Amino acid sequence: STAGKVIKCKAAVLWELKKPFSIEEVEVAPPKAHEVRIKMVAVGICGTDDHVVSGTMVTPLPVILGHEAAGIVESVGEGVTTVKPGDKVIPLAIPQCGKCRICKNPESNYCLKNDVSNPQGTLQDGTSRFTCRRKPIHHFLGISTFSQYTVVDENAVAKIDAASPLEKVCLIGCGFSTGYGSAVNVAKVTPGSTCAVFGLGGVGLSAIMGCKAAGAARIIAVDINKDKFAKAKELGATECINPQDYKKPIQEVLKEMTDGGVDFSFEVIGRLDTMMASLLCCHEACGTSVIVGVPPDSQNLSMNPMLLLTGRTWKGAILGGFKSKECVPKLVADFMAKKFSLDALITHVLPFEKINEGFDLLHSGKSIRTILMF
Amino acid sequence: STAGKVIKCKAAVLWELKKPFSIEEVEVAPPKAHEVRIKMVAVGICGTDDHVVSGTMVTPLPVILGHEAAGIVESVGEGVTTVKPGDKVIPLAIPQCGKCRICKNPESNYCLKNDVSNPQGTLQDGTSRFTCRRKPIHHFLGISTFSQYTVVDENAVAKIDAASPLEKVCLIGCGFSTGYGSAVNVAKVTPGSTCAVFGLGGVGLSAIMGCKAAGAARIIAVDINKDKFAKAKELGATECINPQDYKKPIQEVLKEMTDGGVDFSFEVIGRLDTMMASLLCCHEACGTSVIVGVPPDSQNLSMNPMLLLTGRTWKGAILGGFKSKECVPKLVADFMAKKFSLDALITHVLPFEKINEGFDLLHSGKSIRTILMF
Ligand SMILES: NC(=O)c1ccc[n+]([C@@H]2O[C@H](COP(=O)([O-])OP(=O)(O)OC[C@H]3O[C@@H](n4cnc5c(N)ncnc54)[C@H](O)[C@@H]3O)[C@@H](O)[C@H]2O)c1
Ligand SMILES: NC(=O)c1ccc[n+]([C@@H]2O[C@H](COP(=O)([O-])OP(=O)(O)OC[C@H]3O[C@@H](n4cnc5c(N)ncnc54)[C@H](O)[C@@H]3O)[C@@H](O)[C@H]2O)c1
Ligand SMILES: [Zn+2]
Ligand SMILES: [Zn+2]
Ligand SMILES: [Zn+2]
Ligand SMILES: [Zn+2]
């Protein structure tokens, strides 16, 4: 008898920047018209959540983060039609209202209802459903999945296969889809081409997978943490190199081993230097570089337009260019059909309450993707 | 009678920066192995030529500029097979050696024998054929066409139709091709799309032509010089706007008149502010911005990677992505077949000796393209 009533559960709240998550008792208000309340089951730790912690990604505080999750619908608000109580769903970091210029554009996914452009830390109606210590807590990416119970908007949640292993498919909510899509959709890696992926975390590795599926001949993985090279090779990388083992700049290294540069480069870290390096390593006359990593807020790049005049294409994308609510269930369907494996990405599992340990694991470089089970 | 002997003629020499061309007598050495000596007939004044004069584009001085021309082959050096004495030809500012990684890549045109990346001011063998005041004069883009006679490398000259009107087709050597190609090949303007073209010079207007040819629904021409608007509209622009007539940034203006941005934006001026505004005016989620205009040397752009993260493609090209030796004769064939008209581009004609007047016309904005006849 929770429907229509305020739920009292636990969530990881971030009260201040650069501090540990505080597991506290919060209050989830029941879903409003066209909103959905979800009981979380599993949530992965993505670099993006870390960025907000470090103040790298600006978003209102206090807030409950988390965005790469999967759970069960507890209760539906007035007017919901796409999902109902008991449904296995994956909340979406980028929604699909289906009524905006972009949603109606078959080749784009950055819906206007997104809370990325101008982070408000609220649901689409401009209000919050969270309270903790008699104070309203903000939402994150409209979904806030670092909670046992979360109220999202109907267009920011996809109904998925009822037989879906929620502890694995949560990764399709952000990580896997982003990396894989970046290579398939965005870059459109062509068969026999040479690729370079900077960053071997969950998203980067997925990107190598995408490059492999796309039929790339050479897939060079780049990372300062050599302990990630094993997984890289496993997932499709033909060779892994470390920037620190070289005297010359990494881009000059990549150009040397590839006759002037790769056909496609990806930056899946979130740093300006590596974004410049990635762009610089693709051939000046035919290269395509894709920015996947999210850089620190307000830091700007300094670039010479001649880098593009010669013949390069520089582009970016969120969620790998997949229209969220529409493609997510399709990707889940593909997973259940043995199209791809997510096991390699998952290295650690921990109960939600040990959330801070998951972030420690990320900072140490021992983990790729850690799943928090509620 | 001139074959194998040094020819003495007149050329427009630039001895110093920010100074007038000095019409002096020069010595053109006969063509060496795989070289072609051409008697010029007509040459157009392109903004790139002006850039070198102002020191905005760095290249070795003293130098003989000119790169958008047409003439007749006077003689060929040992081993030439592609052209011969008496043939109408167009020298190529970007050669097509046909033996480099890029010449072999059917989708790229920036051949390695180009003298843009690391300007030497010499022919491909690293030497020069020009002497003036008993001093070695440098070449420009390997063709140096502001001279009655010039020696170029075989791979930097294309044989064209014998009936080709040289006083018009010279624009196909740089101006027209660059603008048209940017719209067709590079950007790949789609039918029913909305474009924005910054810069209504000969190159920008050709871009507009390309957009109309590609099937764009809306074509917004931007320029500070309103006297260009008539030609812009004549060539295909649906509307013309001047940045100076508004209070807010031109990109904010364009985004407002196009529901958030254009599908394709083109910068054909050569300034950092317009390159940033052009990128900004295309839709954040589906926009494609092409850099056509060459910015001042060493000046760097300051840009937030987030502008691409949302879903924008940024790219650039030289010669509109056309493989020079290959495509040039094809475009000439297209012209002879009435596929397109060049007349509109040509606003003034002057004899070679009055070269400085041409640059005066440019600086005043009364001219689009001025053709110097030898
Ligand atoms: N475009 C998107 O929609 C989208 C989606 C999800 C995540 N992201 C972003 O993608 C980026 C990567 O995410 P992640 O989840 O894979 O996180 P992650 O922290 O686990 O991976 C970072 C990886 O980069 C490596 N690395 C760090 N500095 C390096 C350097 N200087 N040179 C080479 N390698 C270095 C680290 O060792 C680690 O392997 C982050 O910025 C995240 O915010 C973007
Ligand atoms: N990529 C290439 O291969 C290639 C080839 C040829 C030329 N170009 C470059 O393209 C650019 C255009 O060449 P062009 O021959 O057509 O030059 P142009 O001087 O004839 O025209 C420049 C145009 O831009 C307009 N303009 C100048 N400042 C402006 C501003 N602040 N806002 C709006 N409009 C402004 C001028 O009024 C003029 O109409 C130059 O940089 C030239 O070097 C590039
Ligand atoms: Zn939408
Ligand atoms: Zn994420
Ligand atoms: Zn030019
Ligand atoms: Zn070549």
Swiss-Prot record, chains A, B:
Segments crossing the lipid bilayer: none
Residues the record lists as binding Zn(2+) 1: C46, H67, C174
Alphabetical list of Gene3D superfamilies matching this protein: Medium-chain alcohol dehydrogenases, catalytic domain, NAD(P)-binding Rossmann-like Domain
Pfam families for this protein: ADH_N, ADH_zinc_N
Reaction catalysis annotation: a primary alcohol + NAD(+) = an aldehyde + NADH + H(+); a secondary alcohol + NAD(+) = a ketone + NADH + H(+); butan-1-ol + NAD(+) = butanal + NADH + H(+); 1-propanol + NAD(+) = propanal + NADH + H(+)
Record has NAD as a keyword: yes
Location of this chain's protein in the cell: Cytoplasm
Bound cofactor: record note: Binds 2 Zn(2+) ions per subunit.
N-acetylserine modification, residue list: S1
GO cellular component: ciliary basal body; cilium; cytosol; nucleoplasm; plasma membrane
Keywords: Acetylation, Cytoplasm, Metal-binding, NAD, Oxidoreductase, Phosphoprotein, Zinc
Function (record text): Alcohol dehydrogenase. Oxidizes primary as well as secondary alcohols. Ethanol is a very poor substrate.
Name of the protein in question: Alcohol dehydrogenase 1A
Gene label: ADH1A
